[PDB]
Write a protein that holds these residues in place. Structure first.
Motif, PDB file in Angstrom:
ATOM      1  N   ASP A 166      19.970  18.857  10.985  1.00  0.00           N
ATOM      2  CA  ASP A 166      18.750  19.507  10.536  1.00  0.00           C
ATOM      3  C   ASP A 166      18.233  20.461  11.620  1.00  0.00           C
ATOM      4  O   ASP A 166      18.847  20.624  12.676  1.00  0.00           O
ATOM      5  CB  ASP A 166      17.738  18.450  10.065  1.00  0.00           C
ATOM      6  CG  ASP A 166      17.113  17.634  11.200  1.00  0.00           C
ATOM      7  OD1 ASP A 166      17.605  17.629  12.344  1.00  0.00           O
ATOM      8  OD2 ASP A 166      16.100  16.967  10.928  1.00  0.00           O
ATOM      9  N   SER A 167      17.076  21.076  11.381  1.00  0.00           N
ATOM     10  CA  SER A 167      16.485  21.957  12.381  1.00  0.00           C
ATOM     11  C   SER A 167      15.146  21.461  12.894  1.00  0.00           C
ATOM     12  O   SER A 167      14.481  22.177  13.655  1.00  0.00           O
ATOM     13  CB  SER A 167      16.301  23.367  11.804  1.00  0.00           C
ATOM     14  OG  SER A 167      17.539  23.949  11.451  1.00  0.00           O
ATOM     15  N   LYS A 223      15.559  21.272  16.559  1.00  0.00           N
ATOM     16  CA  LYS A 223      15.704  22.511  17.290  1.00  0.00           C
ATOM     17  C   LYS A 223      14.328  23.081  17.611  1.00  0.00           C
ATOM     18  O   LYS A 223      13.289  22.500  17.291  1.00  0.00           O
ATOM     19  CB  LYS A 223      16.533  23.488  16.463  1.00  0.00           C
ATOM     20  CG  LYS A 223      18.013  23.174  16.476  1.00  0.00           C
ATOM     21  CD  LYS A 223      18.784  24.150  15.622  1.00  0.00           C
ATOM     22  CE  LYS A 223      18.938  25.523  16.233  1.00  0.00           C
ATOM     23  NZ  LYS A 223      19.795  25.466  17.438  1.00  0.00           N
ATOM     24  N   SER A 247      11.550  26.147  17.034  1.00  0.00           N
ATOM     25  CA  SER A 247      11.216  27.161  16.039  1.00  0.00           C
ATOM     26  C   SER A 247      11.655  28.566  16.460  1.00  0.00           C
ATOM     27  O   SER A 247      12.165  28.802  17.558  1.00  0.00           O
ATOM     28  CB  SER A 247       9.717  27.146  15.759  1.00  0.00           C
ATOM     29  OG  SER A 247       9.341  28.259  14.969  1.00  0.00           O
ATOM     30  N   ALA A 248      11.416  29.521  15.553  1.00  0.00           N
ATOM     31  CA  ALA A 248      11.842  30.901  15.749  1.00  0.00           C
ATOM     32  C   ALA A 248      10.888  31.686  16.637  1.00  0.00           C
ATOM     33  O   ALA A 248      11.269  32.741  17.155  1.00  0.00           O
ATOM     34  CB  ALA A 248      11.986  31.607  14.400  1.00  0.00           C
ATOM     35  N   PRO A 287      20.473  30.607   2.608  1.00  0.00           N
ATOM     36  CA  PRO A 287      20.238  30.786   4.050  1.00  0.00           C
ATOM     37  C   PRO A 287      21.410  31.396   4.800  1.00  0.00           C
ATOM     38  O   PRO A 287      22.468  30.787   4.960  1.00  0.00           O
ATOM     39  CB  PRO A 287      19.926  29.365   4.530  1.00  0.00           C
ATOM     40  CG  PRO A 287      19.285  28.757   3.368  1.00  0.00           C
ATOM     41  CD  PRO A 287      20.113  29.223   2.223  1.00  0.00           C
ATOM     42  N   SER A 322      21.159  32.332   7.933  1.00  0.00           N
ATOM     43  CA  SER A 322      21.044  31.875   9.316  1.00  0.00           C
ATOM     44  C   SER A 322      19.785  31.027   9.412  1.00  0.00           C
ATOM     45  O   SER A 322      19.154  30.716   8.394  1.00  0.00           O
ATOM     46  CB  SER A 322      20.996  33.045  10.303  1.00  0.00           C
ATOM     47  OG  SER A 322      21.087  32.594  11.644  1.00  0.00           O
ATOM     48  N   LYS A 323      19.462  30.599  10.636  1.00  0.00           N
ATOM     49  CA  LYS A 323      18.232  29.857  10.890  1.00  0.00           C
ATOM     50  C   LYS A 323      16.993  30.635  10.469  1.00  0.00           C
ATOM     51  O   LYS A 323      16.049  30.063   9.912  1.00  0.00           O
ATOM     52  CB  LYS A 323      18.153  29.497  12.366  1.00  0.00           C
ATOM     53  CG  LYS A 323      17.113  28.469  12.661  1.00  0.00           C
ATOM     54  CD  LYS A 323      16.641  28.598  14.072  1.00  0.00           C
ATOM     55  CE  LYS A 323      15.863  27.382  14.442  1.00  0.00           C
ATOM     56  NZ  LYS A 323      14.576  27.340  13.705  1.00  0.00           N
ATOM     57  N   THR A 324      16.983  31.941  10.721  1.00  0.00           N
ATOM     58  CA  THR A 324      15.803  32.764  10.507  1.00  0.00           C
ATOM     59  C   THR A 324      15.838  33.510   9.185  1.00  0.00           C
ATOM     60  O   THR A 324      14.775  33.862   8.665  1.00  0.00           O
ATOM     61  CB  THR A 324      15.613  33.757  11.658  1.00  0.00           C
ATOM     62  OG1 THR A 324      16.813  34.513  11.849  1.00  0.00           O
ATOM     63  CG2 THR A 324      15.265  33.019  12.938  1.00  0.00           C
ATOM     64  N   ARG A 369      16.876  34.663   5.207  1.00  0.00           N
ATOM     65  CA  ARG A 369      17.201  34.293   3.833  1.00  0.00           C
ATOM     66  C   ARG A 369      17.452  35.465   2.898  1.00  0.00           C
ATOM     67  O   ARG A 369      17.968  35.234   1.802  1.00  0.00           O
ATOM     68  CB  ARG A 369      16.110  33.397   3.225  1.00  0.00           C
ATOM     69  CG  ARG A 369      16.180  31.945   3.684  1.00  0.00           C
ATOM     70  CD  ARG A 369      15.330  31.639   4.897  1.00  0.00           C
ATOM     71  NE  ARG A 369      15.292  30.205   5.159  1.00  0.00           N
ATOM     72  CZ  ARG A 369      16.191  29.565   5.898  1.00  0.00           C
ATOM     73  NH1 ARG A 369      17.206  30.230   6.434  1.00  0.00           N
ATOM     74  NH2 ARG A 369      16.089  28.259   6.093  1.00  0.00           N
TER      75      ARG A 369
END
Lengths: 62, 187, 258, 142
Positions: free
Chosen positions: B5-6, B9, B11-12, D127, D129-131, D133
């Motif tokens: 999961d994140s 981690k 955040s952005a 998704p 990537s992480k950031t 969409r």
RNA sequence: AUGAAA
RNA sequence: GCCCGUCGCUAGUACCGAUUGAAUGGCUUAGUGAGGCCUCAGGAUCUGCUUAGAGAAGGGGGCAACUCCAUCUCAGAGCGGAGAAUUUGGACAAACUUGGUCAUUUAGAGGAACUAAAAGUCGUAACAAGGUUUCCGUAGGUGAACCUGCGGAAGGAUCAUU
RNA sequence: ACCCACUCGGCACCUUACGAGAAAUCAAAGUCUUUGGGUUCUGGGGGGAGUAUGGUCGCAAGGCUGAAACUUAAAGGAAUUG
RNA sequence: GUCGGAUUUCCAACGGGGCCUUUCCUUCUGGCUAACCUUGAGCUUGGCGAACCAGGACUUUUACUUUGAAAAAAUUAGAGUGUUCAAAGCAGGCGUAUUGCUCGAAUAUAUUAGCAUGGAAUAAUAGAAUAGGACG
RNA sequence: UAUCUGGUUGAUCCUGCCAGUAGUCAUAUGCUUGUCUCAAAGAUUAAGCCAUGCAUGUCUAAGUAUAAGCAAUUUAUACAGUGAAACUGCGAAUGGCUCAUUAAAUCAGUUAUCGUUUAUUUGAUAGUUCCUUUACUACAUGGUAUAACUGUGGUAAUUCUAGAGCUAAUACAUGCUUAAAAUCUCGACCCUUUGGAAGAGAUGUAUUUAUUAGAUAAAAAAUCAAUGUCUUCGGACUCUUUGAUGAUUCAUAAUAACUUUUCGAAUCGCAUGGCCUUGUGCUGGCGAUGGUUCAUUCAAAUUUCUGCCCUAUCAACUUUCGAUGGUAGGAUAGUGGCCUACCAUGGUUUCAACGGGUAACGGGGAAUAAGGGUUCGAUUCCGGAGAGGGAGCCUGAGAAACGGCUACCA
């Protein structure tokens, strides 16, 4: 879990307590109509206030 | 276990999330396979919903496709010689997807002889008619001809053996063939 | 929460079952079936709070287990089975047939009917697909999965079935100018005769619909349910026939029918 | 953008087997797909030698869900950009608004060449990537 | 020059 | 009349403060690192098959040595199945030790304030031109209000010299 | 260089008070319960306190930002008569 | 013209839809050919595609605002109901009371944000100027 | 029901606060308390610790019964009634308690899964399993324990268990039995050369890879690499067929193989019915259980847009050793820095990032009002988190389970 029983009063105390005119009027009403409680008097006044707010906010409309 | 999961981690924006939950089973991971060659051993692992998952290891033989002909034969695996992801996987000789390995080329060779009757490297009426009809197509190209001369043929693993228990792949041809021999010969 | 839900409280149970907020703090959970959780009427609340044929869940389970009851031509001996929309129920005792349809007040009604009107039903197709071995097939709004149908049957159509087998008596396509029934929203129970529609490609196909008092509205294409052609309904309809008169008009109606 | 096969791996469209044996016209093949919702697969995407599997048109990343429009503010990343959604959030008590922005990042294909200030619309895809969409489908500036 | 508390 | 400050008594509240102060909780460098899980081996133990030769019974046949197969027996050989203790390497990583850091409270010799309190002492700074017009900023001085120097203001005791 | 008339921008003045303000007063301190032209900065009883602490600037003197605990029913403004 | 209900030509207003006044207010394939110039004697054989639709196509942007779908009950407001009144609750009512009959359990609210939506005032918003400019 | 009042003064007008007043599903306490109905109740400080006792076990007509258990079959010689214990199959992941954690995190409205799992239900759905495929093999049906029990017992104690002897299955491990056609290969043979060919192996389902089809804006011409349908071998050439989607490498079909081999009933209760080639021959019903795939349903997990209290006596935060992106791979049930290898240096910020505080779970809502609003919301309902703090994991469809285990800390 049991859905809770609604309860709501059927009276409302005076905003301003000690006005001799008001007190004498509701005492007049109790002693002529055979009452025990300014609670009861407030109750009747509360019903009248309910219908009066309804009457106002209905007759406001066309 | 390895989480997926994140919430573990950052955040952005650059903010450490707080510890909110304990790890779950629907966000887990598991260790890599590190699949090797010789004396086929396949342990299986139980997944979400039964749904078995053949974790390949030590796989000696696999399936390989020739796509212009649509055929698919079983062969051993000499070893991996190139992997774009990691020279470490190259060194330790570990099979994964997209992996460039060498195979015997002999079942394709003998099948080629039986199917076209045309030599490599260096009788009955029905079989003669068959080869005569399938002729004008034994002219593939020089690099594959050299590879059939050598008896060690370049294939790409395209399966996911740690998910499937299957080293499956395909012989290289033409464009990407030239690209990968260029990468090997690059000195 | 770590797995499927199994219990169901009152006040999370839907409105239209009309379950009372007193008399125990738990509600009947519809076990899985050919219909959803919320748009479904369990047989327990059916027998116990629409007909009063029984008084207690023990008695209703007694009935279901001694097999006086049967849905879709099969016994269905579970106390919390989903009796969904359009569905049929047959009681040998009294030789009655109740139908589970909607009313205009947004509730599961009680449609008294006969044995042939039980022996056929209606079902909207939810989608069409191609099964294994090259067998085209379709699937309805009641979990019914049916094979080798007509190509004229496309999505949003409705089928009428034999109920002794899963085969077809006939079908009805979707097009402008057909009698319908609404399932979802404020318009629960309306009957309103398609006048046109609109696409909005990307989601939420909408349909303009009006009932015979000229009164129009708009509804979602997955909430509608087509019941046939103009005039004649393909079944018998409950009290009101989907009109939704005003509160004052209904007041006058009952005060005339005191 | 000098070399399509820049990376160590062989970037291509999966399963599109351009058969080396037959030598027919248009020697190499290219898959594509119309995204839907009234969008257009550009002629640069048709003729393109590039791959970019994360593209909606030539790649395999279906657009579905929300759609948004904004102006680009970053371009300094590799097949990825960031846009700015200038909007106005209402406050009922004071009965008037306030500027707010949310700099969502999106993915961009080689089918578009975008400098800063190029207004752009996108589509919700899975998704990337992480950031990220979203993925771009039309540009509206120069 | 200063002038106790209510 | 009203009022200011030091000093003196009583009580409280907070601040500075030696104590390399003390606690509580979180994040965490470094070190040790259980316990399971995954993979390299391990192999007690149990167990199936293939033969495997003989101590010699039984019957069938040269009926006499001898011959055919089953048999209680035991090595010996491979062909395997399951297989716990133990074990390499890996990832997850509790916990402890050591530092760093962030917050939340807290002890304290003493020092310097503030507040309150019916009648304490020293003066009389301010309010009238308050008895040297007051005040503002800055600097020095002194028991205390306070004085004085340089500039500024009127909230001045002048809205005013054709 | 003066005189007359006009003009634009100034430093202000004399009188009224339609208008405003608690009042003194004010050509804005007006066009505000007949409440909105645009924007900035500040104040929320008096004291404690522009103190304590923490940053920051300065050679220093000190400046900028800047509370709390605790205490109190008043302090304060403008005018009237003595 | 019903004995205080509802109708016509209605003079007028009130908001709505359409045509023209230099006002293209996207058009090509189509089938509907549409409104059919199509007319057979007074009800006939043949007009220009959106008024139904699939597409090719330019669809410069918003904010705003209208309308709709949707927003779990309980709560709130509110309909009906003699729990002996009331708080309540959603029950109850009517029979020839032996077969039984029967209305109910409404309706409203649902912020911002998201979807579609008629409008084009208001507020900004780029457009073709050492024309790489549009119809061609 | 859009209300005011007392207090600085000798008195007056003001600013400005104090106090008064009314309410609270807002608590505590005092004093008092006759009745009817309804009912909150160890939340605030300590998510501090807990003695004792309960809270999930469970069977039918129908998985397994020689209870050396109890009635009696006498319709039954194998039982066929009931039935402890035990094996098996389910469930114990729901419910219930608290609000400690948590400030783009949960949550609320609103989207997606064209990016995935889904027991259970519900509707459909396994002629193709003899693998030197002729003796290699019972299919009126095959093998192995092991519990319960018998007895020997051992510890001070434990829902402690060992030793020896049985026996069961829907427990384990195995296992054949039903069409017809249609193409590939071989390929006997004729040998033809236009080339004709008997006979043989394959094809169900599932996994994994590769390939093709899975569609279609408009009309004619020149030939052949070799005529291809049938021939007037002048060439007439038509006939052609593919569903859904906003949109797919979709559904789906077929070639070529992979599999250590998935599923394709060795299960059970009632009723016993018909054909005669008069055989325990052949056929037959109402059911229960399970079973591969698809669909459904209860769910589950990620996900789009918008919104959160106080703080600048917090202005730069993130990136060593993942921060932002890309490519490839591992892992996942699945996308994806989720993790690794390599590469680019990015990502957030005065439109208040990041850090700190919170007597902060969020919401539906509660008190309170002309309007605007302010305050509260642990608490019956929805979604989250947790079981003394952390970490890990078996079984299972579903747990990071705690009325389940393993370790450490207290």
């Amino acid at each position: 879990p049991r859905a809770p029983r609604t309860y709501s009063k059927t009276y409302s105390t005076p905003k301003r307590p000690y006005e001799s005119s008001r007190l004498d009027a509701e005492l007049k009403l109790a002693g002529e109509f055979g009452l025990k409680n300014k609670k009861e008097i407030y109750r009747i006044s509360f019903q009248l206030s309910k219908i009066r707010r309804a009457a106002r906010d209905l007759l406001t409309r066309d | 276990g390895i989480s997926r999961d994140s919430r573990h981690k950052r955040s952005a924006t650059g903010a450490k999330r707080a510890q909110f939950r304990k790890k779950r089973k629907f966000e887990l991971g598991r260790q890599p396979a590190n699949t090797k060659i010789g004396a086929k051993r396949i342990h299986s692992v139980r997944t979400r919903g039964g749904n078995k998952k053949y974790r390949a290891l030590r796989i000696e033989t696999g399936n390989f496709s020739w796509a212009s002909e649509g055929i698919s034969k079983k062969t051993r695996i000499a070893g991996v010689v190139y992997h774009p992801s990691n020279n470490e996987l190259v060194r330790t000789n570990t099979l994964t997807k997209a992996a460039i390995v060498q195979i015997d080329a002999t079942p394709f060779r003998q099948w080629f002889e039986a199917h076209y009757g045309q030599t490599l490297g260096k009788k009955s009426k029905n079989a003669e008619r068959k080869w005569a009809a399938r002729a004008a197509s034994a002219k593939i190209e020089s690099s594959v001809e050299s590879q059939f001369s050598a008896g060690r043929l370049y294939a790409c693993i395209s399966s996911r053996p740690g998910q499937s228990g299957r080293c499956d792949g395909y012989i290289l041809e033409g464009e990407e063939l030239a690209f990968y021999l260029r990468r090997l010969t690059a000195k | 929460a770590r797995g499927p839900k199994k219990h169901l409280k009152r006040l999370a149970a839907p409105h239209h079952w009309l379950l009372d907020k007193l008399s125990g703090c738990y509600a009947p959970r519809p076990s899985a079936g050919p219909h959803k959780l919320r748009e479904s009427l369990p047989l327990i609340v059916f027998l116990r709070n629409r007909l009063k044929y029984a008084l207690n869940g023990r008695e209703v389970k007694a009935i279901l287990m001694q097999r006086h009851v049967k849905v879709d031509g099969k016994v269905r001996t579970d106390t919390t089975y989903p009796a969904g929309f359009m569905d049929v129920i047959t009681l040998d005792a009294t030789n009655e047939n109740f139908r589970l349809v909607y009313d205009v007040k947004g509730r599961f009604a009680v449609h008294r009917i006969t044995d042939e009107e039980a022996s056929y039903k209606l079902g909207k197709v939810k989608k069409v697909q191609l099964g294994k071995k090259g067998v085209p097939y379709v699937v309805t709004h009641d979990g019914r999965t049916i094979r080798y149908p007509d190509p004229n049957i496309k999505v949003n159509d409705t089928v009428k079935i034999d109920l002794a087998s899963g085969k077809i008596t006939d079908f009805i396509k979707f097009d402008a100018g057909k009698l319908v029934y609404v399932t979802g929203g404020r318009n629960l129970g309306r009957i309103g005769t398609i006048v046109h529609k609109e696409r909005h490609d990307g989601g939420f196909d909408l349909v303009h619909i009006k009932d015979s008092l000229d009164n129009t509205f708009v509804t979602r294409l997955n909430n509608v349910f087509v019941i046939g052609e103009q005039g004649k309904p393909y079944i018998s309809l409950p009290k009101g026939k989907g009109i939704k008169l005003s509160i004052a008009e209904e007041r006058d109606r009952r005060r005339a029918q005191q | 953008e000098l070399t399509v096969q820049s990376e160590r791996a062989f970037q291509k469209q999966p399963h599109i087997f351009n058969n080396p044996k037959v030598k027919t016209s248009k020697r190499t093949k290219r898959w594509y797909k119309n995204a839907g919702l009234g969008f257009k697969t550009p002629k640069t995407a048709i003729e393109g030698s590039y791959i970019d599997k994360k593209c909606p048109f030539t790649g395999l990343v279906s657009i579905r869900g929300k759609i948004l429009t904004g102006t680009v503010v970053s371009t300094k990343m590799h097949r990825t950009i960031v846009i700015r959604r200038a909007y106005l959030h209402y406050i009922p008590k004071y009965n008037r608004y306030e500027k707010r922005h949310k700099n969502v990042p999106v993915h961009v294909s080689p089918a578009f060449r975008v400098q800063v200030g190029d207004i752009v619309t996108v589509g919700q895809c899975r998704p990337i990537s992480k950031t990220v969409r979203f993925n771009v489908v039309k540009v509206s500036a120069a």
